[PDB]
A paper describes a structure:
Sorcin (Soluble resistance-related calcium binding protein) is a calcium binding oncoprotein expressed at high levels in several human tumours, such as leukaemia, gastric, breast and ovarian cancers. Each monomer of Sorcin homodimer is formed by two domains, i.e. a flexible, glycine-rich N-terminal domain and a C-terminal calcium-binding domain (SCBD), endowed with five EF-hands3031. The SCBD can be divided in two regions: EF1–3 (residues 33–134), which binds calcium with high affinity, and EF4–5 (residues 135–198), which mediates dimerization. Upon calcium binding Sorcin undergoes a large conformational change that allows it to bind and regulate a series of target proteins in a calcium-dependent fashion.
In CaSor, Ca2+ is bound at EF1, EF2 and EF3 and it is hepta-coordinated in a classical pentagonal bipyramidal configuration. EF1 and EF2 are coupled by Gln48, which coordinates the EF1-bound Ca2+, whereas in EF2 is hydrogen-bound to Thr89. The binding of calcium to Sorcin promotes a large conformational change, which involves a tilt of the D-helix with respect to the G-helix, with EF3 acting as a hinge. The opening of EF1 and EF3 causes the exposure of two distinct hydrophobic surfaces that likely mediate the interaction of Sorcin with its molecular partners. The analysis of the CaSor structure reveals the presence of an electron density peak in the cavity formed upon calcium binding and the consequent tilt of the D-helix. We fitted this electronic density map with the GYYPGG hexapeptide belonging to the N-terminal region of Sorcin (residues 12–17). We can exclude PEG binding to Sorcin structure: the Fo-Fc and 2Fo-Fc electron density maps shows clearly the presence of a short peptide containing side chains with a very well resolved proline residue clearly visible in the structure (12-GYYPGG-17), belonging to a different dimer. The residues buried at the interface between peptide and Sorcin are: Met78, Met81, Leu82, Glu97, Ala100, Val101, Gly104, Trp105, His108 placed on the D helix; Phe112 on the EF3 loop; Thr131, Met132, on the EF4 loop; Val164, Arg167, and Asp171 on the G helix. Trp105, Glu97 and Arg167 form hydrogen bonds with Tyr13 and Tyr14 of the peptide (OH Tyr13-OE2 Glu97 = 2.78 Å; O Tyr13-NE1 Trp35 = 2.74 Å; O Tyr14-OE2 Glu97 = 2.90 Å). The residues laying on the D helix play a major role in interacting with the N-terminal peptide; in particular, Trp105 establishes a strong stacking interaction with Pro15 and is hydrogen bonded to the carbonyl group of Tyr13, determining the orientation of the peptide into the pocket which is opposite to that of Alix in PDCD6 (see below).
Author numbering:
A (entry chain D): 12 to 17
B (entry chain A): 26 to 198
Write the structure that this text describes.
C-alpha cells in the first residue's frame, strides 16, 4: 500500500 | 534481473546515486530526492519517507534499492505528486489539516477528525504538510491500518495485542 488510494 | 538495462535512459542517474556498491540505500536516496527538488523548498526530503519507500518497493528482500525498484520509485512519486496536488485545493504547495481530512476520507480511511488534526500537526511545523511528509503520513497510516485489519479476524474494530507483537509491528514503520 505504497501507492495513493484516492 | 536484466543485465542489458544499462541501455535504459535512467540507468546513468541510478548508477550515480547508487555509487560504489551498485545499490541505493536510504541516505543516498535522501540526497537524491533532496537535490531533485521534487518536494520543493530547501528542507531535506524526509529520510523516513526514503526508508519507507526503500522498504516497500523492495522486490528481493535486499533492504536496498536496485535499478528496477528505482524505476518504480519515480512512477510512485509521480502518483503521489498528483494525489498531493489534487488535495491542495488552495494551491499553497502544502496540505492543511482540512485538506488532509478530505484526502484520507477519499482514500477510504475512517478516522476521528480530532486525530486527523493531531496527525497533521505531527507531520508539519504549523499544520501545513509538505509533499515528502504527506507521503510518510499516508503510507504509515495505511501500513498500520493494514496491520490492524489482519489481526482483527472478527472485523470488530478491536485487536488484542501482546506486547511483542505490538512493538515489532509499530517499530517497523
Ligand atoms: Ca550505494
Ligand atoms: Ca532490493
Ligand atoms: Ca493547501
Amino acid at each position: 500500500g505504497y501507492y495513493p488510494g484516492g | 534481473a536484466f543485465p542489458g538495462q544499462t541501455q535504459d535512459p535512467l540507468y546513468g542517474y541510478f548508477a550515480a546515486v547508487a555509487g560504489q556498491d551498485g545499490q541505493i540505500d536510504a541516505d543516498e536516496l535522501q540526497r537524491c530526492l533532496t537535490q531533485s527538488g521534487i518536494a520543493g523548498g530547501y528542507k531535506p526530503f524526509n529520510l523516513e519517507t526514503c526508508r519507507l519507500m526503500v522498504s516497500m518497493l523492495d522486490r528481493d528482500m535486499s533492504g536496498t534499492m536496485g535499478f528496477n525498484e528505482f524505476k518504480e520509485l519515480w512512477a510512485v512519486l509521480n502518483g503521489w505528486r498528483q494525489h498531493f496536488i489534487s488535495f491542495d485545493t488552495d494551491r499553497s504547495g502544502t496540505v492543511d489539516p482540512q485538506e488532509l481530512q478530505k484526502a484520507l476520507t477519499t482514500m477510504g480511511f475512517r478516522l476521528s477528525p480530532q486525530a486527523v488534526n493531531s496527525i497533521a500537526k505531527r507531520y508539519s511545523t504549523n499544520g501545513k504538510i509538505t509533499f515528502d511528509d504527506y507521503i510518510a503520513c499516508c503510507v504509515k497510516l495505511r501500513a498500520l491500518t493494514d496491520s490492524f485489519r489482519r489481526r482483527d479476524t472478527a472485523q470488530q474494530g478491536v485487536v488484542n495485542f501482546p506486547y511483542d507483537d505490538f512493538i515489532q509491528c509499530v517499530m517497523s514503520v
